[PDB]
A paper describes a structure:
Thereafter, the multimeric toxin is secreted into the extracellular environment by the [name] type II secretion system (T2SS).14−16 When produced in E. coli, we could not recover CT from the growth medium. Interestingly, assembly into holotoxins was shown to be promoted by the A-subunit, which on its own is highly unstable and prone to degradation.
To test if CT was secreted, the supernatant was directly loaded onto an IMAC column, and the elution fraction was analyzed by SDS-PAGE. Two clear bands matching the sizes of CTA and CTB were observed (last lane), confirming successful production of the toxin. CT appeared to already be almost pure after this step; nevertheless, the protein was subjected to SEC to assess the presence of CTB and remove aggregates or contaminants that may not be visible on the gel. For each of the independent trials of toxin production in Vmax, at least 10 times more CT was obtained in Vmax compared to E. coli (2–12 mg per L culture in Vmax vs. 0.2 mg in E. coli). By inducing expression with 0.02% l-arabinose and loading the medium on a galactose resin instead of IMAC, up to 20% higher yields were obtained. The structure was refined to R/Rfree values of 22.1/26.2% and exhibited good geometry based on the Ramachandran plot as well as small deviations from ideal bond lengths and angles. Since expression in Vmax was performed at a lower temperature compared to E. coli (30 versus 37 °C in E. coli), we suspect that CTA may be less affected by thermal degradation in this system, leading to a more homogeneous production of the holotoxins.
Numbering used by the authors:
A (entry chain D), C (entry chain H), D (entry chain G), E (entry chain F), F (entry chain E): 1 to 103
B (entry chain A): 1 to 237
The structure:
């Protein structure tokens, strides 16, 4: 069982860590059909999505996708510093798998 | 209690909102760490009021009445065709300068209360517009303010301010009451006060710690409010 | 997969972008039958709705409609600057499809 | 489709607008059986409920009732100024149908 | 229909009003099996629970129990003054039925 | 029925209390498949998880796990002082069973 996001990320083949150590610059949210998703950017231009729920997600991920969208919204609004993102890099933009926050 | 303080300032409300409050000189946003700036009350109080109402060296000064602040505004902010008087809640980020500096308060005449780290948006009750010296007696209420929280708070006791007084080490204040009993290391008769710079450092670090702890209180109040919409039942059905 | 709200908006017929760069002026919320909706206005007078769930929405939109109403409420209360809205313009008032927030 | 709370209120029998332009003075919440409801008061003494879900509500209202109780809680705690309530006046206390908040 | 917590409390057997007029001193939360509950204390030593969901609750209460735990958490964190609790006094500690907040 | 976290913790095999009296230093959150979990650390280096829902959890715990992840997120962001954690110590990192926060 991983004790940090880096160890967690290393358990998956199609993942990588981004180190940001910065607050989210922009938060975007959509309810348009087939694009029920969220997008965040950082001021350095890096862009990430929370994927539309699909058949590549198992049932236990569905609730976690919703949680992640919650987390990003509140992170944006409180200007919380994001340390690292773990993302799947076989998507454009890269798809968030995990987030870590520390001051 | 629901006592208010007052500060004439040229920075308009939109800039205050962007900065997250009324900022010391040098500080961009309220929730920046204290390491950004020099935090020293003595230094803050000695500053010249030429152009701006004292806001140097990590503190932002306020007056104890609307009338005081308007008068100060007409002296200092003579030149701005519009400035604002910010109405400000009392809270323990706020020190009575004359009590803390005591007999060494360099402007006892002005009965100033000063905020360590500046004044967060949430602590600002509202503002008056001042157009060509003429106060407009219609107050604008700040929607970021929390009356129930701040009405429950008062300014800091002087005893909480003595250690942060920020006299240089060689100053006789550190060797007299009340300050002697609150003196930082290296200040006063602590060995090598004149040679060490340990004094000015501990002053800074005790200041930064204070702002850290105070920023935690602000975050907890404001950011808890922001999360009071959460309904667990939605997600667990 | 779009990387911003403008790209997202362009994927749909009968949509357009409004650029507001301002906080929400008013927020309205209703639980009256057949009018379970939200309305927001900006100080320039622009007015937008989150539509009542209906037969024009697919199932995956239902959760996103609820999310959007959450987002607008909290945006209003925190006085967050809204950058852009993507809206369907074949409704009156215009119906929100996506929102973006930036500093 | 109404563009404001006043227009919305006018669509329903047995409704009226209260203009408060004040923060909520008190918030009350119950989980007691058959009384799972919320009550708010203003300093002028005005008192309002969110009704217990019942057979007078259609299914689409159920989620909106829950949302409204959320909104009132967070409105209370952030000391947000409430502009207007639309209420059913064939109940005691008057039952909230919609709320508007404005800068 | 009650217009305040006192009137509400009087409708139930085995209930009592406590008048606290104070913020919550401590909040405790558990996900341990059979003890999925919350406990709050006040500085005067008074201690209250939100009960584990059980067969003494009807279905309509289940959502309200979850709501109450939300309310108490956020009440604790915002240091909101609790006016009164309505509690069932045939439990130890006393079980919260309703809360009122003012001042 | 326990009246505090210490009494609660004592009801379970393989649990222990940590007394932290400190804010959370870091918060991590994952939606990666089979690792839908949260991790927190304190500045003293202590590290704790909320476990992935599994067969060691009964159904009533599922909602409480979700609640706990909410609580930790909000605790992190508000810089709330955590008093004590009750944890299962037959997991690495130790698995949170309960949390307490006090003024
Ligand atoms: O579990 C989510 C992930 O699923 C994988 O199969 C896919 O390669 C990723 O793009 C991501 O969608
Ligand atoms: O859906 C679960 C909950 O998620 C919260 O983040 C949101 O603000 C609430 O309104 C509720 O929707
Ligand atoms: O899904 C939402 C959208 O659905 C479309 O069919 C319709 O043209 C739009 O006005 C909007 O309702
Ligand atoms: O939809 C809720 C409303 O339903 C009506 O039928 C009723 O007359 C109102 O008092 C209110 O309960
Ligand atoms: O609905 C919850 C209540 O149910 C009652 O039957 C019980 O006597 C109370 O102690 C309380 O548990
Ligand atoms: O209820 C969940 C708990 O179940 C126990 O049996 C186990 O020893 C703990 O590690 C924890 O997983
Ligand atoms: Na990897
Ligand atoms: Na005060």
């Amino acid at each position: 069982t991983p004790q940090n996001i880096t160890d967690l990320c290393a358990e998956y083949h199609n993942t990588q860590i981004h180190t940001l150590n910065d607050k989210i610059f922009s938060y975007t949210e959509s309810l348009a059909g087939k694009r029920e998703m969220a997008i965040i950017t950082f001021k350095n231009g890096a862009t990430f999505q929370v994927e539309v729920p699909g058949s590549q997600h198992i049932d236990s991920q569905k609730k976690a996708i919703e949680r992640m969208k919650d987390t990003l919204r509140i992170a944006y609004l409180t200007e919380a510093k994001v340390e690292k993102l773990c993302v799947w890099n076989n998507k454009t933009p890269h798809a968030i798998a995990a987030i870590s926050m520390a001051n | 209690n629901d006592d208010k303080l007052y500060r004439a300032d040229s920075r308009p409300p939109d800039e205050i909102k962007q900065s997250g409050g009324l900022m010391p000189r040098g500080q961009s946003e309220y929730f920046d760490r204290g390491t950004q700036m020099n935090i020293n009350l003595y230094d803050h109080a000695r500053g010249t009021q030429t152009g701006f109402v004292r806001h140097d060296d990590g503190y932002v000064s306020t007056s104890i009445s609307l009338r005081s602040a308007h008068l100060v505004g007409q002296t200092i902010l003579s030149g701005h065709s519009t400035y604002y008087i910010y109405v400000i809640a009392t809270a323990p980020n706020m020190f009575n300068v004359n009590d803390v500096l005591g007999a060494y308060s360099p402007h006892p005449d002005e009965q100033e209360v000063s905020a360590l780290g500046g004044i967060p948006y949430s602590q600002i009750y509202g503002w008056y517009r001042v157009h060509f010296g003429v106060l407009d007696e219609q107050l604008h209420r700040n929607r970021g303010y929390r009356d129930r929280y701040y009405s429950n708070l008062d300014i800091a006791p002087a005893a909480d301010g003595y250690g942060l007084a920020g006299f240089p080490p060689e100053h006789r204040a550190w060797r007299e009451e009340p300050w002697i009993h609150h003196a930082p290391p290296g200040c006063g008769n602590a060995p090598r006060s004149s040679m060490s710079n340990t004094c000015d450092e501990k002053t800074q670090s005790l200041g930064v710690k204070f702002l850290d702890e105070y920023q935690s209180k602000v975050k907890r109040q404001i950011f808890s409010g922001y999360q009071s919409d959460i309904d667990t039942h939605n997600r667990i059905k």
